[PDB]
Amino acid sequence: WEGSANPRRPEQISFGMSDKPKFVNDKIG
Amino acid sequence: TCTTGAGVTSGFIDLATYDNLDRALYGGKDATTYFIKEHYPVGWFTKLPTMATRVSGNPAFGQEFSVGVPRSGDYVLNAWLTLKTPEIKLLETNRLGANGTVRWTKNLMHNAVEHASLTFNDICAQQFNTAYLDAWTQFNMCEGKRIGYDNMIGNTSDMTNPTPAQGQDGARTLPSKNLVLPLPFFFSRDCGLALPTVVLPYNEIRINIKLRSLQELLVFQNKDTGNVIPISATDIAGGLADTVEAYVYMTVGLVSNVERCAMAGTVRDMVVEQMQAAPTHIVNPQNTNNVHVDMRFSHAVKALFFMVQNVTYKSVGSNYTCVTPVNGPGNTVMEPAMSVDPIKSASLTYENTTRLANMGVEYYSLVQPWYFSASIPVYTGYHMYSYALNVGSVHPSGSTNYGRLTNASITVTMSPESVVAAAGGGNNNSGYNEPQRFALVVIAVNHNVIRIMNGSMGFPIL
Amino acid sequence: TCTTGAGVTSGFIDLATYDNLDRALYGGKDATTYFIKEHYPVGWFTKLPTMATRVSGNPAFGQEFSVGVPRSGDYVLNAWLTLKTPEIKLLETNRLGANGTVRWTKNLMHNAVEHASLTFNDICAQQFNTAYLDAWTQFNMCEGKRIGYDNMIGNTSDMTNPTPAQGQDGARTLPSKNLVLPLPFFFSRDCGLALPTVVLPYNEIRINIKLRSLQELLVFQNKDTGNVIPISATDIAGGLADTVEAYVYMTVGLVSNVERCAMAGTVRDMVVEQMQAAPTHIVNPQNTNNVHVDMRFSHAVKALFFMVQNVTYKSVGSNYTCVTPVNGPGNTVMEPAMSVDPIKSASLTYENTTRLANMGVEYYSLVQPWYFSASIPVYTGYHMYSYALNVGSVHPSGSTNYGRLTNASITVTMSPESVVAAAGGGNNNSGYNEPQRFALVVIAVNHNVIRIMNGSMGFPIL
Amino acid sequence: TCTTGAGVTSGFIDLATYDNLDRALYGGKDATTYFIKEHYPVGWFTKLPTMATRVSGNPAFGQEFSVGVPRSGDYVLNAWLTLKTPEIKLLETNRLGANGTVRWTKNLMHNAVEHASLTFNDICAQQFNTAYLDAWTQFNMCEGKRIGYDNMIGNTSDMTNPTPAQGQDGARTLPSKNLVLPLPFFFSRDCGLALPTVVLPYNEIRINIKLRSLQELLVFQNKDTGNVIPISATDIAGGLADTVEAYVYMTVGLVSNVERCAMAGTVRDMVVEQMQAAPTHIVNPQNTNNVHVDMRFSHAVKALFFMVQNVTYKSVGSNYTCVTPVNGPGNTVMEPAMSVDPIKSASLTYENTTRLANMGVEYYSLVQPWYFSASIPVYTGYHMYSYALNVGSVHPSGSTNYGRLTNASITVTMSPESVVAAAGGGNNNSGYNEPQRFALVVIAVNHNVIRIMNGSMGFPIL
Amino acid sequence: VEYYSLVQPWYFSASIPVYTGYHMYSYALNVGSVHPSGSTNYGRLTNASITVTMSPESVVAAAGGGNNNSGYNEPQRFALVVIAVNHNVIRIMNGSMGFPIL
C-alpha cells in the first residue's frame, strides 16, 4: 500500500528588519 | 369525527385558517421555508495543542517569567496556564497556637497572576490583572461552564476550607492538585480573530506572567477573634516552596496550502478590545462619604467596571465587601451577618455636566447586567455601566470616544455599614473587629485597530 | 517521526487525509473560511437612562397611577419600575398571640402589579398581569440571570422568612429595600423594535399601573396549625402605609441627525406580540373531576399557558399547588410532602373534533418546554402548549389564527390528591387543614401588526 | 447646564465626540442601523404529536421491540419514549435480612435502553446506547433544562434513595411515575434535518429498542458492609414483572400543498452524524498501568469520548469512578471517602507517531469542554477530544477522516487510587471492600452523507 | 539467541559486544557504512511482528526466593526494547532545509 506522501518545508525565519513603521495621529489629544 | 392517535386529519383544520394576517406574515414565492437547510462549504483546516517554550528564567512565586510564542504555525487562538500548587502542612508551633487555621485564599486563580502581558517584539499590545479577570468572569461567564470554571480556578470547597493544627480535631492537609487558568486575549476572544503567524515573520511574540509571593497567597486566620496575620516559613511544615513548576499551553491551527498561498502577502486590519485600569485611590469613609475620581482614557470606551475592595489584609484577596470573611462552624468559612457592598450610590459627570444622575447601587448591580450582559454577578460589588448593547459581542456597538472628550469624573457615596465597619471595636467572629481600609478601582474596556502589513504589526491610530 | 516542542508534522498528517467526503464537505473557491471575520460598519448612536414624568395621581398601594412617556427622544427600547418596600415590625398584641408569624408573600414582584398596560392616547396596545408575568419568567429565563432576577423580585431569604413576635426567641424585622420590576413590552422584547418618538410627535404614550393593598401582600400565618387569617392595622406596628415610594425609569437612545432626516416621514410596519387572558373559572374537584373551558381568541395564537391556582387565601399568591405552603422548622417556610399539581391530564377540542388527545400532565410540564422553549420551570404547575418551534423567537413562525377558527375548548382532569385536599380535615402543619378552593387561568400570546404613518399609529386589521 | 430627569441633552456631547476611529468603525451610506428589523415571510405549516404504531414484539424488560414510523406526515422532526415504572416494596424475607436496602440505579433512563436503532428497509441507518446518551447529555446539555431532564429521566432523589425493609424505620415504597426519554436522532438533532416522508413512499422506516432485564436495574445494597448482590423476585412484594407500559411518540409537521408539490420528485443531499463504538476492553491495573487500544473508524470523525466504567456489579451502572457508591446515614446514597477517575494521562498515536502528547486527565476533563463544547460535565470522568471547533454545531467543522488514515491508538495510564482500589482490603462503608474491575469504552462521532432520490434513500458513499 | 549475538555482528559489523544481550539484525552488508546498502522500506510493507521466546532461567528468576548475594532475591521484571536505524533524504535549497518525502 502506497502510503501517500507529505513533505515538510518550514516557511522562513528571518533575522533582519526591512523597515519599522512609525506612529502618527496619536489619540492623546 | 374520530381520533386514533396516529392520524393527522386534525392538522388540516388548523391549516385551513389562512386569513389576511397569516397571508401577510407567511407565504410568497420568495418566502423561505423551514425543514430545508442551505449547505455551504467551509475551509479545510486542522488544530492541535502546542508546547510553549520558556525563554526567561523559571517559574517561581513572586517572580516574573516570559514565554515566547511557537512559530511554524498558521494561527494561534488559545492560551492557558497550568500550575501545580504546593502541598501545605500546618505545624503545631504556629504563632496562633491551637486557635490558628491556614487556608487558601478565595479565587486562587485570578490571584497570583498580575500584569499578564502580551508583547510584539518590544511593543506592548495589552495586559490584564486580577480586577479585570474577576470582573470579566463574573459578568460574561456562560452558565453550565460555571462548575468547570470554579473547579479549575480553585474554589473547590477543599482548598478554601480552614484546616486546624495537627494536634487539633482537623488534621486534613490541603491537596496539591494542578489548576488551569485560561488567558483572555484578543485572539482568544473569538475564532474570527487569530494571530497570523505566517504573515508575521519579523515580529517576535512574547507573553509575560508575573506570579505573586506565596506569603499573601495563604490566609492565616484566628479561630476565635477572627484576626489575620501573615504566614511564616516556620508556621508550616516543610518550609515555603518558593519555586513553583508550571506550563503555558496554546492551540495552533493549520490551514491548506492553497489558502495560505492566496492569503500570503496582503494588508489586514483587525479590531480588538483592550483594558485600561485607573490608578487605585484610597477611600476613608470616616472622614468623608463622597469621593470623586477623575477618569483619563483614550479610545472608544465600551464599558466601565468598578468596585470597592477590602484592602485591610494582603493575605485575603478578591474581597469587595466592607467586612472580611471569618471562620465558621464545621471547619468552614462564612460571611458575617453585616456583609454588604460599601457603595451606596454613584454618578458620572462630564466637565460639570452629570450625564448620569446619582442612581442607586442596585441599578448598576442588577438592572444594567440584566439588559447589556450575558450573566448577573452572584457576589456583592462589581458595578458596571456599558455604553454598548452587548458587552460580550466582539462586533462594535454603542460607545463614546474619550480622546476628544473633555475630562470626566465619577462620584461615589459610601454607606453607613461601611462607615461603622471602618471603625473597629467589633466583637469576636464579626470581621470588623479591627479597623478596615478600602480602595477604589476602575476598569475600562476600549476598542482599537491593529494593522498587519509588510510582515509587521502596529497601531495606526495609537 | 518526532513530537517535541511545536508540532506541525501531526497537523500535516491530518491534513493529508483528503477524500471524496472531505472534498464534498470542505474546499472550493466559493467556500467560506474561518479565522477571518468580515467587518461591516453599523450606525452611530448613543443611549442613556431617562426619568419618566408622572402626570396623574400619586403612587400608592391599592389604586391606579399613570406615567407619560418622555418626548424629545429618538428611540425608546427599555422600561422598568422601582419601588421601595415599607418596614414591617410585629407586635405582641397580635390576635394569634405567640403562635403567629408575619412574612412577605412569595414572588413579591409580579404581585401587586396587575393589569399593567401601555396606552396610545386612549387606545390600548398591550396589557399584562401576574399570571402572564409568572409564566413568561418561568418559561423564558436565560440562565445566569435567574439569580439576579430572583434577587430583584425578592425571595432573598429575608422577605419570605417568617418572623415571630418580639417576646419570643426570634424578633427579627423585615428589611426595607428597593426592588426593580422590568416591563416586558413589544419594544422591550427585541432591540430591533423600538418606539419612534421622533416619528410620533403628536401621539401620547402612557404607562398605567395598578397596585394592591398591603393586606393581600402580607401573609399572617399561624405557627402550629398552619392557618392564615387576613392582616389588620392593629396587629403590627407603624400601621398600614397607603403611600409608597415608587418611580418608573425608561432608556432612550439618541441617533445621528444624518439618518433621522432621511427616515422622517416614512411608513413603518412592525409585528408585535400581545397577551390575552381567558376569564377565570372556579373549579370544585369535590363535585366534578373534569373541567371544560371555552376559548374565544382573535389573532394568530403563538402559545397557551394554563395552570390551576390555589385561591383559598387572597393573602397568599403565585401558588399553583393543591396544598398551601406552611411554616417549617428553623424559622423558615417548608413545602408539605403532599404537594403536587392538581391537573392530571389535559386535552384540546375543535368543534367536537379532538385535535390533541388526553395527553399526560408530564407532557406539557417537561416534554413541550424541552423542545419548544428556552427553559424548563422549576416549580409545580405552569403547563404550556406551543404552536411554533421557538416561543421566545421574535420572528414569526408556525401559528394558527383563531379569527377563522370556530369555538374551541380545553378539557382538564383533576387528581386524587386534589379531590381529597379540596375538603378539610388535615392536621396541624398539613396545608389542607381548611377546605381548599381552586381556579383555572388560561393565557394566550398572539401576534399583531402595527403601522406607523403621518405621526400616528393604528391597527390595519383590528 | 441643567440636570433634568427627562432631559436628553447629556448624550449630545457623546454624539458630537466623533473621531477618525469612530469614522472607521461607524458611519457610511451603506452602514446598517439598529432599531430596524428586516422582514422575510416563512412557510405556512403546522405540527401535532402522533402515536407510533408498534409492528413487532411487546414492551418487556430484557427483550427488543420494534415500532414503525407513521406515514402521511410531511416531515418528522421529533421522537421520544415514555415508560411507566413498576412499584417496588421490600419484604422481610430478603436474604440480607434487616441489613438490606433496595434502590433504583442511578440514571434509570439511559439504562434499560440499549442498541436503540433507526433503520430504513433492512439497513441500519444509525444506532446508539447508554454510553453515547450519557456522553451527549453531559457534554451538550443547555443549563436551565438540566433540572427538567433530571426530573424526567429519573434519579430525582425519590428513586435513588435507599428504602430499608418493612420492619426497619424506612418503609417507604418507590413511586410509580412515568418517565420520558427523548431519542437523539439525525432528524431530532436539527429542525432543518427532517425525513421527507412524503418524498419517501417506498422505504419502511423502523425503530428498534432493546430494553434491559429488571435484575440489573435494581440495586440491592447492604446497610453495614455496603455489598451488592443481584436482586431476587422473592425479596420484593408482588414479584418481578417482565411486561411494561412503553409508548413511542413522534411529532409530524404538515406543510402547505404548494410547497409539498413544488419539491416533489427532486434529488436531495443531506449531512448527518453517526456513532462508532470501539469494542469494550478489560483493564487490569495490577499487572500493568499502561493500556493501548486500537481504533478502526471510517468516516470524518468529529469527536471522541473515552471513559473507564466500574463493572464489578452488573446491577449498578453509570459508574465511571474508581470506587462503587455505598449506602449512607439518613437513608440516602453518599459518595465514599475517595472517588476519582482512574484515568491519569492519555495520548493519541498515529502509526507510531504520537500526534497528541501525554496530556493530563484534567485537560480532557475541563479544558477541551471549556473551549469546544456548550457545557462541562459535573461528574468525574467523561473525557473528550474534539477535532472540530464546535461539537454541538450541526454545520460541519474541521475533521479528519479515518478511512485514509492508518490505524490509530489510545495509550492511557491508570492511577494509584485505581490500582489500590482494584485490590480488596477496604473496610465497611468504603466502596472498595471487594476487588474492583474496570473496562475502557471508546466512542466516536462522525459525519455521513444521505441522498434522497426516486422516492428512496441510501448512502452514495457507503 | 547466539545467532543474533555472534554470527550477525561477526559478518555485518566492526565489533562484537562483550556483554550479554544486544541482539541485532541488519538488512545491509555493513551497519556502520554511511553509504546505503541492502534495505527494505516498511511504509509499503504491511504490518510486521517480532516474536521472542523466554528462558527457563528467566521464568525461575522472575519469582523471588533467591538467597543473599544472588541478585534475584526479590521478584524481577523485564521490558522489551526495539530500536530501528533507517535512511532518509534531506534537501537544502533557498536557505532552508526540509524532507522532500518525510
PDB file of N, CA and C in Angstrom, chain C residues 3 10 14 17-19 21-22 26 41-44 50-51 75 143 191-192 268 271 355-356 362-363 370-373 376 386 389 395 398-399, chain D residues 5 14-15 25-27 31-32 35-37 39-40 44 47-49 78 80 143-145 178 180 182 191 350 354-355 397 399 401 404 449:
ATOM      1  N   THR C   3       7.836  14.240  18.216  1.00  0.00           N
ATOM      2  CA  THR C   3       6.885  15.166  18.837  1.00  0.00           C
ATOM      3  C   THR C   3       7.620  15.911  19.957  1.00  0.00           C
ATOM      4  N   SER C  10       2.186  16.271  12.832  1.00  0.00           N
ATOM      5  CA  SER C  10       0.884  15.648  13.036  1.00  0.00           C
ATOM      6  C   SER C  10      -0.207  16.404  12.290  1.00  0.00           C
ATOM      7  N   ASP C  14      -2.635  14.872   9.421  1.00  0.00           N
ATOM      8  CA  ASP C  14      -4.088  15.005   9.454  1.00  0.00           C
ATOM      9  C   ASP C  14      -4.617  15.660   8.184  1.00  0.00           C
ATOM     10  N   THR C  17      -5.159  13.555   4.907  1.00  0.00           N
ATOM     11  CA  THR C  17      -6.314  12.664   4.789  1.00  0.00           C
ATOM     12  C   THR C  17      -7.454  13.421   4.112  1.00  0.00           C
ATOM     13  N   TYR C  18      -7.377  13.489   2.786  1.00  0.00           N
ATOM     14  CA  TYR C  18      -8.388  14.136   1.962  1.00  0.00           C
ATOM     15  C   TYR C  18      -8.997  13.101   1.027  1.00  0.00           C
ATOM     16  N   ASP C  19     -10.324  13.022   1.009  1.00  0.00           N
ATOM     17  CA  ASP C  19     -11.027  12.032   0.204  1.00  0.00           C
ATOM     18  C   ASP C  19     -12.255  12.693  -0.413  1.00  0.00           C
ATOM     19  N   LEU C  21     -15.414  12.495   0.577  1.00  0.00           N
ATOM     20  CA  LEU C  21     -16.264  13.109   1.592  1.00  0.00           C
ATOM     21  C   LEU C  21     -15.729  14.472   2.011  1.00  0.00           C
ATOM     22  N   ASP C  22     -14.418  14.570   2.237  1.00  0.00           N
ATOM     23  CA  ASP C  22     -13.827  15.850   2.612  1.00  0.00           C
ATOM     24  C   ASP C  22     -13.927  16.857   1.473  1.00  0.00           C
ATOM     25  N   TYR C  26     -15.795  20.238   2.614  1.00  0.00           N
ATOM     26  CA  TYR C  26     -14.973  21.433   2.665  1.00  0.00           C
ATOM     27  C   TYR C  26     -14.435  21.754   1.273  1.00  0.00           C
ATOM     28  N   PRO C  41     -19.655  48.275   8.766  1.00  0.00           N
ATOM     29  CA  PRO C  41     -19.981  49.381   9.670  1.00  0.00           C
ATOM     30  C   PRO C  41     -21.442  49.354  10.087  1.00  0.00           C
ATOM     31  N   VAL C  42     -21.699  49.869  11.288  1.00  0.00           N
ATOM     32  CA  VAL C  42     -23.045  49.975  11.829  1.00  0.00           C
ATOM     33  C   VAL C  42     -23.339  51.445  12.116  1.00  0.00           C
ATOM     34  N   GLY C  43     -24.580  51.713  12.510  1.00  0.00           N
ATOM     35  CA  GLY C  43     -24.991  53.075  12.770  1.00  0.00           C
ATOM     36  C   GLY C  43     -24.329  53.661  14.002  1.00  0.00           C
ATOM     37  N   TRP C  44     -24.231  54.988  14.006  1.00  0.00           N
ATOM     38  CA  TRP C  44     -23.636  55.735  15.107  1.00  0.00           C
ATOM     39  C   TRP C  44     -24.755  56.290  15.980  1.00  0.00           C
ATOM     40  N   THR C  50     -33.438  57.695  31.273  1.00  0.00           N
ATOM     41  CA  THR C  50     -34.228  58.914  31.367  1.00  0.00           C
ATOM     42  C   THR C  50     -35.372  58.705  32.345  1.00  0.00           C
ATOM     43  N   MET C  51     -35.572  59.674  33.232  1.00  0.00           N
ATOM     44  CA  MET C  51     -36.691  59.626  34.159  1.00  0.00           C
ATOM     45  C   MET C  51     -38.006  59.825  33.414  1.00  0.00           C
ATOM     46  N   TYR C  75     -35.480  57.068  20.281  1.00  0.00           N
ATOM     47  CA  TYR C  75     -35.939  55.687  20.337  1.00  0.00           C
ATOM     48  C   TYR C  75     -36.051  55.261  21.791  1.00  0.00           C
ATOM     49  N   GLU C 143     -30.383  31.452  31.681  1.00  0.00           N
ATOM     50  CA  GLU C 143     -29.613  31.023  32.839  1.00  0.00           C
ATOM     51  C   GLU C 143     -28.481  32.001  33.127  1.00  0.00           C
ATOM     52  N   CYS C 191     -34.203  44.485  20.408  1.00  0.00           N
ATOM     53  CA  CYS C 191     -33.618  45.782  20.085  1.00  0.00           C
ATOM     54  C   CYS C 191     -34.120  46.307  18.749  1.00  0.00           C
ATOM     55  N   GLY C 192     -34.473  45.413  17.823  1.00  0.00           N
ATOM     56  CA  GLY C 192     -34.958  45.841  16.524  1.00  0.00           C
ATOM     57  C   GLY C 192     -36.297  46.548  16.568  1.00  0.00           C
ATOM     58  N   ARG C 268     -43.901  52.914   8.477  1.00  0.00           N
ATOM     59  CA  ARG C 268     -43.238  51.835   9.195  1.00  0.00           C
ATOM     60  C   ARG C 268     -44.226  50.707   9.454  1.00  0.00           C
ATOM     61  N   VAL C 271     -44.245  43.998  13.556  1.00  0.00           N
ATOM     62  CA  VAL C 271     -45.005  42.908  14.156  1.00  0.00           C
ATOM     63  C   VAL C 271     -44.777  42.946  15.661  1.00  0.00           C
ATOM     64  N   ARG C 355     -58.394  17.529  18.516  1.00  0.00           N
ATOM     65  CA  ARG C 355     -57.110  17.743  17.858  1.00  0.00           C
ATOM     66  C   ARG C 355     -55.972  17.131  18.663  1.00  0.00           C
ATOM     67  N   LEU C 356     -55.972  17.346  19.976  1.00  0.00           N
ATOM     68  CA  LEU C 356     -54.947  16.821  20.868  1.00  0.00           C
ATOM     69  C   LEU C 356     -55.618  15.904  21.879  1.00  0.00           C
ATOM     70  N   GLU C 362     -47.392  15.381  32.571  1.00  0.00           N
ATOM     71  CA  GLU C 362     -45.940  15.461  32.455  1.00  0.00           C
ATOM     72  C   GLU C 362     -45.514  15.870  31.054  1.00  0.00           C
ATOM     73  N   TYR C 363     -46.326  15.553  30.042  1.00  0.00           N
ATOM     74  CA  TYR C 363     -46.037  16.009  28.688  1.00  0.00           C
ATOM     75  C   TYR C 363     -45.904  17.526  28.648  1.00  0.00           C
ATOM     76  N   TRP C 370     -39.078  21.278  26.788  1.00  0.00           N
ATOM     77  CA  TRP C 370     -37.766  20.799  26.363  1.00  0.00           C
ATOM     78  C   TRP C 370     -37.546  21.033  24.874  1.00  0.00           C
ATOM     79  N   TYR C 371     -38.611  20.966  24.080  1.00  0.00           N
ATOM     80  CA  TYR C 371     -38.494  21.045  22.631  1.00  0.00           C
ATOM     81  C   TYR C 371     -38.843  22.409  22.056  1.00  0.00           C
ATOM     82  N   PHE C 372     -39.709  23.179  22.710  1.00  0.00           N
ATOM     83  CA  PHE C 372     -40.159  24.447  22.147  1.00  0.00           C
ATOM     84  C   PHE C 372     -40.157  25.543  23.203  1.00  0.00           C
ATOM     85  N   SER C 373     -39.098  25.602  24.007  1.00  0.00           N
ATOM     86  CA  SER C 373     -38.949  26.668  24.988  1.00  0.00           C
ATOM     87  C   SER C 373     -37.475  26.811  25.333  1.00  0.00           C
ATOM     88  N   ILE C 376     -37.024  25.272  31.383  1.00  0.00           N
ATOM     89  CA  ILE C 376     -37.988  24.355  31.976  1.00  0.00           C
ATOM     90  C   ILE C 376     -38.307  24.862  33.375  1.00  0.00           C
ATOM     91  N   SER C 386     -47.456  24.966  22.645  1.00  0.00           N
ATOM     92  CA  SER C 386     -46.937  25.948  21.706  1.00  0.00           C
ATOM     93  C   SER C 386     -47.218  25.505  20.280  1.00  0.00           C
ATOM     94  N   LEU C 389     -42.115  26.552  16.670  1.00  0.00           N
ATOM     95  CA  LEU C 389     -40.869  25.887  17.037  1.00  0.00           C
ATOM     96  C   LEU C 389     -40.187  26.585  18.207  1.00  0.00           C
ATOM     97  N   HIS C 395     -39.176  36.577  15.559  1.00  0.00           N
ATOM     98  CA  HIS C 395     -39.608  36.339  14.189  1.00  0.00           C
ATOM     99  C   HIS C 395     -40.796  35.380  14.166  1.00  0.00           C
ATOM    100  N   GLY C 398     -44.664  29.039  12.907  1.00  0.00           N
ATOM    101  CA  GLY C 398     -45.912  28.298  12.962  1.00  0.00           C
ATOM    102  C   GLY C 398     -46.927  28.798  13.973  1.00  0.00           C
ATOM    103  N   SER C 399     -48.083  29.246  13.486  1.00  0.00           N
ATOM    104  CA  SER C 399     -49.127  29.774  14.354  1.00  0.00           C
ATOM    105  C   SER C 399     -50.444  29.758  13.593  1.00  0.00           C
TER     106      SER C 399
ATOM    107  N   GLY D   5     -34.375  65.211  34.817  1.00  0.00           N
ATOM    108  CA  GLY D   5     -34.653  63.791  34.677  1.00  0.00           C
ATOM    109  C   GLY D   5     -35.111  63.414  33.281  1.00  0.00           C
ATOM    110  N   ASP D  14     -21.704  63.256  23.791  1.00  0.00           N
ATOM    111  CA  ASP D  14     -21.208  61.948  23.379  1.00  0.00           C
ATOM    112  C   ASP D  14     -21.381  61.746  21.879  1.00  0.00           C
ATOM    113  N   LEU D  15     -22.525  62.169  21.337  1.00  0.00           N
ATOM    114  CA  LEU D  15     -22.733  62.087  19.895  1.00  0.00           C
ATOM    115  C   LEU D  15     -21.735  62.959  19.143  1.00  0.00           C
ATOM    116  N   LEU D  25     -15.051  52.899  12.217  1.00  0.00           N
ATOM    117  CA  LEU D  25     -15.944  51.875  12.751  1.00  0.00           C
ATOM    118  C   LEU D  25     -17.382  52.076  12.279  1.00  0.00           C
ATOM    119  N   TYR D  26     -17.962  53.232  12.582  1.00  0.00           N
ATOM    120  CA  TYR D  26     -19.361  53.521  12.325  1.00  0.00           C
ATOM    121  C   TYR D  26     -19.491  54.361  11.057  1.00  0.00           C
ATOM    122  N   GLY D  27     -20.710  54.808  10.770  1.00  0.00           N
ATOM    123  CA  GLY D  27     -20.948  55.735   9.686  1.00  0.00           C
ATOM    124  C   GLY D  27     -20.913  55.076   8.321  1.00  0.00           C
ATOM    125  N   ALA D  31     -23.835  51.612   5.728  1.00  0.00           N
ATOM    126  CA  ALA D  31     -23.782  51.059   7.073  1.00  0.00           C
ATOM    127  C   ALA D  31     -25.188  50.791   7.593  1.00  0.00           C
ATOM    128  N   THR D  32     -25.394  49.596   8.140  1.00  0.00           N
ATOM    129  CA  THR D  32     -26.687  49.242   8.701  1.00  0.00           C
ATOM    130  C   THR D  32     -26.910  49.974  10.022  1.00  0.00           C
ATOM    131  N   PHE D  35     -32.429  49.254  15.756  1.00  0.00           N
ATOM    132  CA  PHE D  35     -33.797  49.740  15.935  1.00  0.00           C
ATOM    133  C   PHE D  35     -34.653  49.492  14.696  1.00  0.00           C
ATOM    134  N   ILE D  36     -34.095  48.810  13.700  1.00  0.00           N
ATOM    135  CA  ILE D  36     -34.802  48.463  12.474  1.00  0.00           C
ATOM    136  C   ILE D  36     -34.546  46.992  12.183  1.00  0.00           C
ATOM    137  N   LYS D  37     -35.618  46.223  12.019  1.00  0.00           N
ATOM    138  CA  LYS D  37     -35.528  44.790  11.782  1.00  0.00           C
ATOM    139  C   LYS D  37     -36.148  44.460  10.433  1.00  0.00           C
ATOM    140  N   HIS D  39     -37.814  42.119   7.454  1.00  0.00           N
ATOM    141  CA  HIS D  39     -38.910  41.160   7.480  1.00  0.00           C
ATOM    142  C   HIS D  39     -38.845  40.275   6.246  1.00  0.00           C
ATOM    143  N   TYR D  40     -38.969  38.962   6.454  1.00  0.00           N
ATOM    144  CA  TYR D  40     -39.000  37.997   5.366  1.00  0.00           C
ATOM    145  C   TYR D  40     -40.031  36.932   5.721  1.00  0.00           C
ATOM    146  N   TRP D  44     -45.823  28.288   5.430  1.00  0.00           N
ATOM    147  CA  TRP D  44     -47.053  28.066   6.179  1.00  0.00           C
ATOM    148  C   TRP D  44     -47.158  26.581   6.502  1.00  0.00           C
ATOM    149  N   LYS D  47     -47.996  21.617  13.118  1.00  0.00           N
ATOM    150  CA  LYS D  47     -47.448  20.402  13.702  1.00  0.00           C
ATOM    151  C   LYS D  47     -48.367  19.909  14.810  1.00  0.00           C
ATOM    152  N   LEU D  48     -48.282  18.609  15.090  1.00  0.00           N
ATOM    153  CA  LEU D  48     -49.063  17.994  16.156  1.00  0.00           C
ATOM    154  C   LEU D  48     -48.447  16.645  16.491  1.00  0.00           C
ATOM    155  N   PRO D  49     -48.475  16.236  17.758  1.00  0.00           N
ATOM    156  CA  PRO D  49     -47.905  14.935  18.125  1.00  0.00           C
ATOM    157  C   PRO D  49     -48.772  13.788  17.636  1.00  0.00           C
ATOM    158  N   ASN D  78     -39.086  14.820  15.527  1.00  0.00           N
ATOM    159  CA  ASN D  78     -39.041  14.602  16.968  1.00  0.00           C
ATOM    160  C   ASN D  78     -39.555  13.217  17.342  1.00  0.00           C
ATOM    161  N   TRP D  80     -39.730  10.463  20.982  1.00  0.00           N
ATOM    162  CA  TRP D  80     -39.397  10.197  22.373  1.00  0.00           C
ATOM    163  C   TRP D  80     -40.170   8.982  22.864  1.00  0.00           C
ATOM    164  N   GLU D 143     -28.019  24.578  30.143  1.00  0.00           N
ATOM    165  CA  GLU D 143     -28.419  24.821  31.521  1.00  0.00           C
ATOM    166  C   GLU D 143     -29.812  25.437  31.568  1.00  0.00           C
ATOM    167  N   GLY D 144     -30.522  25.163  32.658  1.00  0.00           N
ATOM    168  CA  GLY D 144     -31.910  25.559  32.772  1.00  0.00           C
ATOM    169  C   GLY D 144     -32.829  24.398  32.460  1.00  0.00           C
ATOM    170  N   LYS D 145     -32.465  23.615  31.447  1.00  0.00           N
ATOM    171  CA  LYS D 145     -33.167  22.381  31.130  1.00  0.00           C
ATOM    172  C   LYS D 145     -32.580  21.172  31.842  1.00  0.00           C
ATOM    173  N   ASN D 178     -44.372   7.844  35.376  1.00  0.00           N
ATOM    174  CA  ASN D 178     -43.899   7.659  34.012  1.00  0.00           C
ATOM    175  C   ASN D 178     -42.703   8.561  33.727  1.00  0.00           C
ATOM    176  N   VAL D 180     -39.756   9.927  30.685  1.00  0.00           N
ATOM    177  CA  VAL D 180     -39.673  10.287  29.276  1.00  0.00           C
ATOM    178  C   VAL D 180     -38.207  10.366  28.873  1.00  0.00           C
ATOM    179  N   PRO D 182     -36.210  11.446  25.449  1.00  0.00           N
ATOM    180  CA  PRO D 182     -36.107  11.847  24.042  1.00  0.00           C
ATOM    181  C   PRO D 182     -35.060  11.010  23.326  1.00  0.00           C
ATOM    182  N   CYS D 191     -33.916  21.204  13.268  1.00  0.00           N
ATOM    183  CA  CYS D 191     -35.203  21.386  12.603  1.00  0.00           C
ATOM    184  C   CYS D 191     -35.084  21.189  11.097  1.00  0.00           C
ATOM    185  N   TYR D 350      -0.493   7.810  16.043  1.00  0.00           N
ATOM    186  CA  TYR D 350      -0.789   7.568  14.633  1.00  0.00           C
ATOM    187  C   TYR D 350       0.367   6.767  14.047  1.00  0.00           C
ATOM    188  N   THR D 354       3.262   9.905  17.632  1.00  0.00           N
ATOM    189  CA  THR D 354       2.389  10.430  18.678  1.00  0.00           C
ATOM    190  C   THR D 354       1.894  11.814  18.280  1.00  0.00           C
ATOM    191  N   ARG D 355       0.639  11.889  17.829  1.00  0.00           N
ATOM    192  CA  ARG D 355       0.061  13.179  17.467  1.00  0.00           C
ATOM    193  C   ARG D 355      -0.203  14.030  18.702  1.00  0.00           C
ATOM    194  N   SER D 397     -17.581  21.180  10.723  1.00  0.00           N
ATOM    195  CA  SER D 397     -16.373  21.932  11.040  1.00  0.00           C
ATOM    196  C   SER D 397     -15.156  21.069  10.739  1.00  0.00           C
ATOM    197  N   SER D 399     -12.449  18.368  10.595  1.00  0.00           N
ATOM    198  CA  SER D 399     -12.478  16.963  10.970  1.00  0.00           C
ATOM    199  C   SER D 399     -11.584  16.184  10.018  1.00  0.00           C
ATOM    200  N   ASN D 401     -10.863  12.380   8.328  1.00  0.00           N
ATOM    201  CA  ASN D 401     -11.445  11.077   8.043  1.00  0.00           C
ATOM    202  C   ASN D 401     -10.451   9.969   8.368  1.00  0.00           C
ATOM    203  N   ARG D 404      -8.814   7.036   5.147  1.00  0.00           N
ATOM    204  CA  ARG D 404      -7.500   7.184   4.540  1.00  0.00           C
ATOM    205  C   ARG D 404      -6.384   7.268   5.571  1.00  0.00           C
ATOM    206  N   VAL D 449     -23.211  11.115   4.686  1.00  0.00           N
ATOM    207  CA  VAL D 449     -23.979  11.750   3.621  1.00  0.00           C
ATOM    208  C   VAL D 449     -25.113  10.819   3.211  1.00  0.00           C
TER     209      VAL D 449
END
